[PDB]
Amino acid sequence: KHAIPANIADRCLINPEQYETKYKQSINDPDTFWGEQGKILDWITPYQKVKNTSFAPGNVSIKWYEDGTLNLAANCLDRHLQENGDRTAIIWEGDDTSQSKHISYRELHRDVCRFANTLLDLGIKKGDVVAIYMPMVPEAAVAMLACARIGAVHSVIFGGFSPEAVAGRIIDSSSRLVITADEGVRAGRSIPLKKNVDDALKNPNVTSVEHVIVLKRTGSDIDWQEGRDLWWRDLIEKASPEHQPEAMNAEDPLFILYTSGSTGKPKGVLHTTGGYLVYAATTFKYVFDYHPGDIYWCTADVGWVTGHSYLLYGPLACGATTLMFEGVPNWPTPARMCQVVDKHQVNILYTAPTAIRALMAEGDKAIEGTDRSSLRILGSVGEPINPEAWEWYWKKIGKEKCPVVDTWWQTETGGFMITPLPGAIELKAGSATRPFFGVQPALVDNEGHPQEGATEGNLVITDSWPGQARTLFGDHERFEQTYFSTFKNMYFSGDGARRDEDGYYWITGRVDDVLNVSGHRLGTAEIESALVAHPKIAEAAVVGIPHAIKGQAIYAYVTLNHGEEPSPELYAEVRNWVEKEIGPLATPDVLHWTDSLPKTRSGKIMRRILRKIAAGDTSADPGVVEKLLEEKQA
Numbered sequence: 360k361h362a363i364p365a366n367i368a369d370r371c372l373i374n375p376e377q378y379e380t381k382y383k384q385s386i387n388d389p390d391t392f393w394g395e396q397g398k399i400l401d402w403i404t405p406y407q408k409v410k411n412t413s414f415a416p417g418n419v420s421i422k423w424y425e426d427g428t429l430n431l432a433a434n435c436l437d438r439h440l441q442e443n444g445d446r447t448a449i450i451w452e453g454d455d456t457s458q459s460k461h462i463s464y465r466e467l468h469r470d471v472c473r474f475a476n477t478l479l480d481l482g483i484k485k486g487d488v489v490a491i492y493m494p495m496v497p498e499a500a501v502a503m504l505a506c507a508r509i510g511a512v513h514s515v516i517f518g519g520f521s522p523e524a525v526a527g528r529i530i531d532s533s534s535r536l537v538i539t540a541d542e543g544v545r546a547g548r549s550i551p552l553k554k555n556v557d558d559a560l561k562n563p564n565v566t567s568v569e570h571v572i573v574l575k576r577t578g579s580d581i582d583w584q585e586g587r588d589l590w591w592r593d594l595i596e597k598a599s600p601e602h603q604p605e606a607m608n609a610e611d612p613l614f615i616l617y618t619s620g621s622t623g624k625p626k627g628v629l630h631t632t633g634g635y636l637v638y639a640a641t642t643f644k645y646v647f648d649y650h651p652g653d654i655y656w657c658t659a660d661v662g663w664v665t666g667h668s669y670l671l672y673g674p675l676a677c678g679a680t681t682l683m684f685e686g687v688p689n690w691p692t693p694a695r696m697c698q699v700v701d702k703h704q705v706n707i708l709y710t711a712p713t714a715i716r717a718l719m720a721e722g723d724k725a726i727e728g729t730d731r732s733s734l735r736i737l738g739s740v741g742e743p744i745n746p747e748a749w750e751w752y753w754k755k756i757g758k759e760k761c762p763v764v765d766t767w768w769q770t771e772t773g774g775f776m777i778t779p780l781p782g783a784i785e786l787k788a789g790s791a792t793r794p795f796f797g798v799q800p801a802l803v804d805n806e807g808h809p810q811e812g813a814t815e816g817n818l819v820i821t822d823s824w825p826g827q828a829r830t831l832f833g834d835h836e837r838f839e840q841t842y843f844s845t846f847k848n849m850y851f852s853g854d855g856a857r858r859d860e861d862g863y864y865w866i867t868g869r870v871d872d873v874l875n876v877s878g879h880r881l882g883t884a885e886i887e888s889a890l891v892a893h894p895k896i897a898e899a900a901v902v903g904i905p906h907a908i909k910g911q912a913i914y915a916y917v918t919l920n921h922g923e924e925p926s927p928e929l930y931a932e933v934r935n936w937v938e939k940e941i942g943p944l945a946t947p948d949v950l951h952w953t954d955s956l957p958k959t960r961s962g963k964i965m966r967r968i969l970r971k972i973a974a975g976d977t978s979a980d981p982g983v984v985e986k987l988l989e990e991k992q993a
């Protein structure tokens with residue numbers, strides 16, 4: 360156990376007693392609790408209703424603050440202007456540290472109004488989907504907030520997706536517009552963003568895209584399509600800086616994020632406005648102990664939900680200064696992350712176990728010539744953190760003075776679900792600890808029976824909370840199928856967890872067929888598809904194996920079409936194929952050439968033995984197992 364340090368005790372917004380009192384009210388009386396807590400936002404017309412939700416088959420319906428109206432952008436910008444207009448809303452640090460920016464709330468608001476008008480002039484309307492395929496530059500934020508201001512529904516696509524992966528997202532969502540940049544700048548190198556867009560839009564099934572707006576980030580030679588392609592600067596300069604935000608309903612859709620699942624291709628996890636923003640704002644405030652003047656840095660990409668809730672929306676609703684970093688924590692040197700901390704006097708740092716492990720492998724090279732004294736709070740997200748990593752992070756980065764908040768949540772959950780509160784809860788290395796206000800977790804066996812006491816099982820949430828995803832885009836029936844059918848009347852997270860004698864949770868990872876690779880959520884089925892699309896590949900089974908930096912690696916058992924021979928040319932080729940289908944993020948670390956896939960007489964693939972064998976673990980046609988072991992050895 361780590362005791363709460365005096366300095367945090369002295370300033371904390373929530374102490375142990377307040378966590379107990381608030382947690383208990385949040386469950387016993389959600390309506391008074393979230394009715395009061397909803398006031399963290401400005402409302403145009405006030406809500407009367409608060410909680411109005413159901414996990415019942417086939418009547419899954421999630422509504423929060425439903426008769427209320429509000430604007431996300433007014434809450435994240437306009438309302439801070441009068442008294443804090445001059446406050447820095449975003450600190451931008453470039454890949455190249457010679458390049459930085461302090462954007463004030465007033466500056467940010469002005470550009471958001473301009474871009475809101477640019478979108479409106481382009482014919483974009485409330486409800487339209489807007490694809491954003493951007494690097495980590497302040498214009499992505501501007502684009503996201505402008506979509507929100509006018510009630511367009513934005514769909515941010517992570518910069519590292521391949522042209523094929525971008526096309527799929529645009530096709531599913533029917534995006535009317537793509538907003539991108541000429542190139543991205545990362546670790547001295549360029550991502551060819553706009554080129555990738557070009558390639559995407561050549562897909563014949565892409566039919567909805569009217570225009571591409573392009574930010575001139577590097578000024579590289581790019582192909583231009585006259586009429587379709589527009590420059591960011593050209594358009595924004597033309598636009599009025601004046602814009603009045605109209606009222607959106609609490610349940611007006613806000614964004615879609617394509618998210619990997621146990622079966623099929625990624626689906627558009629849908630979030631609405633009111634409950635989402637309230638949940639984002641509240642979790643940020645309390646979990647990071649946010650006080651005016653705290654300089655906050657979340658290291659997550661804007662193309663993931665952590666970048667949505669905890670780089671942008673939570674921070675800006677609360678009036679915080681939030682830092683956006685264009686680069687990677689270990690470039691030019693492993694000390695970079697701490698140089699950024701030092702340079703911008705970061706007080707709250709929130710990052711990924713994959714990063715921590717990466718800096719850890721380098722030792723004191725990660726902290727060398729740095730100070731780190733400005734830091735008060737650390738945070739970790741996206742994957743289980745091993746105690747040793749947690750210890751190194753606490754000791755080396757936080758100098759043994761900083762609570763570490765290990766925040767468990769998901770894209771589908773909008774905000775933090777199980778998390779320490781730095782002034783309320785005593786820490787255990789590797790534990791996400793206790794549930795947040797409004798959150799009712801439970802552990803059930805594979806049959807659905809609640810497990811009591813210290814125990815493990817399938818992690819479910821037994822009632823709704825405000826930040827919960829409301830649906831899957833254009834497919835509410837699959838939303839129910841996916842999350843509310845395995846354990847009736849419950850939200851199934853897809854994770855396993857254990858609870859200890861203290862009521863602390865230890866999240867042990869996906870129990871479905873979803874991987875965590877360098878903190879990216881990937882379905883095994885989608886990699887298998889990408890593999891099988893290759894004209895030389897008959898059959899593939901993909902499993903995860905432990906990995907000291909990535910957490911899990913992708914290990915692919917591959918069966919070639921009859922008459923095909925493996926080679927070293929083919930190994931790299933197949934890898935490059937998956938990188939083309941999805942992105943570098945999905946490239947398999949290992950390709951296991953085999954004709955010995957273990958199938959039931961019924962045709963089922965024995966995926967448990969594959970998993971065990973792939974992990975260096977040595978104890979219809981039974982003799983395939985033995986052939987698989989030899990092949991592994993070789």
Ligand SMILES: CCCOP(=O)(O)OC[C@H]1O[C@@H](n2cnc3c(N)ncnc32)[C@H](O)[C@@H]1O
Pocket residue numbers: 618664665739740741742743744765766767768769770771791852853854866867868869875879880
């Ligand atoms: C939260 C931002 C990432 O959102 P995604 O929707 O991409 O991933 C959610 C999944 O990431 C893992 N995960 C996330 N945080 C933790 C965590 N703190 N501990 C263990 N596993 C975690 C859990 O397996 C979960 O089902």
